[PDB]
Amino acid sequence: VKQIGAQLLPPLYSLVFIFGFVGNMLVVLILINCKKLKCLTDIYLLNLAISDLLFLITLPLWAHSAANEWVFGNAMCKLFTGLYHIGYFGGIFFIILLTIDRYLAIVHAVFALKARTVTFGVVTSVITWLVAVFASVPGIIFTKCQKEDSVYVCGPYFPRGWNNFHTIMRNILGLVLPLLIMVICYSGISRASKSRINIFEMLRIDEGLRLKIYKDTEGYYTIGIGHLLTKSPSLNAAKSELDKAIGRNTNGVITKDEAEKLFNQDVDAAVRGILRNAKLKPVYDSLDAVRRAALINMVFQMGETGVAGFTNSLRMLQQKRWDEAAVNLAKSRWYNQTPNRAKRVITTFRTGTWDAYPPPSREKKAVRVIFTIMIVYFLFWTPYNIVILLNTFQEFFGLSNCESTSQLDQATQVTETLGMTHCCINPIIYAFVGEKFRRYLSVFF
Numbered sequence: 001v002k003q004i005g006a007q008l009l010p011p012l013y014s015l016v017f018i019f020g021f022v023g024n025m026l027v028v029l030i031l032i033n034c035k036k037l038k039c040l041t042d043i044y045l046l047n048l049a050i051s052d053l054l055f056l057i058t059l060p061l062w063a064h065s066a067a068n069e070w071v072f073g074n075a076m077c078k079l080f081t082g083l084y085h086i087g088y089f090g091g092i093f094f095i096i097l098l099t100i101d102r103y104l105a106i107v108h109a110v111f112a113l114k115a116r117t118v119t120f121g122v123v124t125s126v127i128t129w130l131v132a133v134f135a136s137v138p139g140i141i142f143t144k145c146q147k148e149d150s151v152y153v154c155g156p157y158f159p160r161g162w163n164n165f166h167t168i169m170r171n172i173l174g175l176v177l178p179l180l181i182m183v184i185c186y187s188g189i190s191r192a193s194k195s196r197i198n199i200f201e202m203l204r205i206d207e208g209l210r211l212k213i214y215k216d217t218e219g220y221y222t223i224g225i226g227h228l229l230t231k232s233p234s235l236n237a238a239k240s241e242l243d244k245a246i247g248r249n250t251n252g253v254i255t256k257d258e259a260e261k262l263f264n265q266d267v268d269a270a271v272r273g274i275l276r277n278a279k280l281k282p283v284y285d286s287l288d289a290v291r292r293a294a295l296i297n298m299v300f301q302m303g304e305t306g307v308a309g310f311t312n313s314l315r316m317l318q319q320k321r322w323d324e325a326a327v328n329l330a331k332s333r334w335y336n337q338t339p340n341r342a343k344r345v346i347t348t349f350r351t352g353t354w355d356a357y358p359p360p361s362r363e364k365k366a367v368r369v370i371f372t373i374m375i376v377y378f379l380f381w382t383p384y385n386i387v388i389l390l391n392t393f394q395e396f397f398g399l400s401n402c403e404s405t406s407q408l409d410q411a412t413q414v415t416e417t418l419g420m421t422h423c424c425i426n427p428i429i430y431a432f433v434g435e436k437f438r439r440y441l442s443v444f445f
């Protein structure tokens, strides 16, 4: 096999090195000089880029050894084995973190939004690098520089039991764990909604989204998704009430996530009020999560006193007569005064679906990117994980032969070579799938 390796590995690894280095370097430059590392997700992508770099800087040494032999010493051997493993495990770990993060985001997990901070990022990133190191320790310890058949090699020399342990450990952290994580996420996504629409999207369309302190048509002061600040002229009074509700010096400006944080506080407060009203409680209890949202929508607009005015319609809703309740609501004063908003609320109540509203785009496009990242990772590293599992545990089960181990080694070499060419793929996936990344490239050039 060595003959083929000397002709193929040096140009292959060199080409991978060139594309991967400038690729992940561009990713880092963007995250620092365009995104400025302000978001939690910017931290993970930064560490993911670092993982690939830590990996591919080792390529020139592996390619040189294939052409000649290992000449850098034992200490250098254990060092680059460390970068090789740490870069690898760090890679898949930070892909999983991003996978979870963007999953929780499209389901609008409240605690995840409250956790979406650079502080939470730095901490969990430090722990992630630790686990990556501890998973690299066995590889480092039993890897040495030794003269085999009058040729120097930087290779692994595990005892019988330790090679078995290392194999199953690698398969868990690099296959079983990510696979399970992804299944959880796919399930949680498909169970939330088929249209991926939450109450957040609904009231964002109907009530709007204020990033700057907005003066109501009457004279009231609002912010975010329909949040009353005060009812009196002074904008200083408005800023005063807002700066208290956030805990920050806002100067009358809010951020998108701060809006949803406020929004969540207003939703459960509305639900709290509904479940405390004698006429709204039995209706609310007989409704599913979709039609309940439409009721919260009406409370968001007219208040519980106003919603309680629809005595007829409420009873019909309470009795699951959607069609008839829909028609009756189209005759109300509320309907004729604000027809377009009412119409799509009436539809929600009638059909019990989000068909009256447009689905989220960027939220879906986000999980499209990160799931693709992980699927492609699987493509590149799964054939290696399996063939070494066969070459370890299940070679005792069956598959036994004299030329077996030799051929299983060949397959191990080839598949690992395949996996080693993955450290240059992520930035390419960004450019092909991710629209924000291409936008960052447009302003870079």
Ligand SMILES: CCC[C@@H]1C[C@H](N(C)C(C)C)CC[C@@H]1N1CC[C@H](Nc2ncnc3ccc(C(F)(F)F)cc23)C1=O
Pocket (backbone or CB within 6 Å): 001, 002, 004, 005, 006, 008, 009, 062, 063, 065, 066, 080, 081, 084, 143, 154, 155, 156, 412, 413, 414, 415, 416, 417, 420
């Ligand atoms: C040549 C140095 C091998 C080196 C070992 C190192 N190792 C896990 C620890 C020391 C970190 C990881 C990185 C390197 N590896 C691990 C295997 C991978 N493929 C190969 N290795 C060595 N001869 C090969 C010859 C032909 C072929 C082909 F399939 F193309 F024909 C592939 C080869 C590689 O390269």
Ligand SMILES: CCCCCCCC/C=C\CCCCCCCC(=O)OC[C@H](O)CO
Pocket (backbone or CB within 6 Å): 364, 367, 368, 369, 371, 372, 375, 376, 379
């Ligand atoms: C060598 C041959 C193999 C090469 C080919 C393998 C490449 C597969 C990569 C990604 C799969 C698509 C990932 C899709 C990510 C999930 C998309 C999603 O969930 O959003 C859809 C949305 O629900 C719609 O309404």
Ligand SMILES: CC(=O)C1=C(O)C(=O)N(c2ccc(Cl)cc2F)[C@@H]1C1CCCCC1
Pocket (backbone or CB within 6 Å): 027, 030, 031, 041, 045, 098, 102, 362, 363, 365, 366, 367, 369, 370, 430, 433, 434, 435, 436, 437, 438
């Ligand atoms: C929808 C979205 O948030 C993104 C893109 O449409 C895109 O190209 N992004 C993007 C941003 C920076 C970098 Cl370096 C690479 C990216 F792909 C962001 C990613 C945010 C992390 C999860 C995956 C999507």
Ligand SMILES: [Zn+2]
Pocket (backbone or CB within 6 Å): 105, 106, 107, 108, 196, 197, 198, 200, 201, 360, 363
């Ligand atoms: Zn959403």
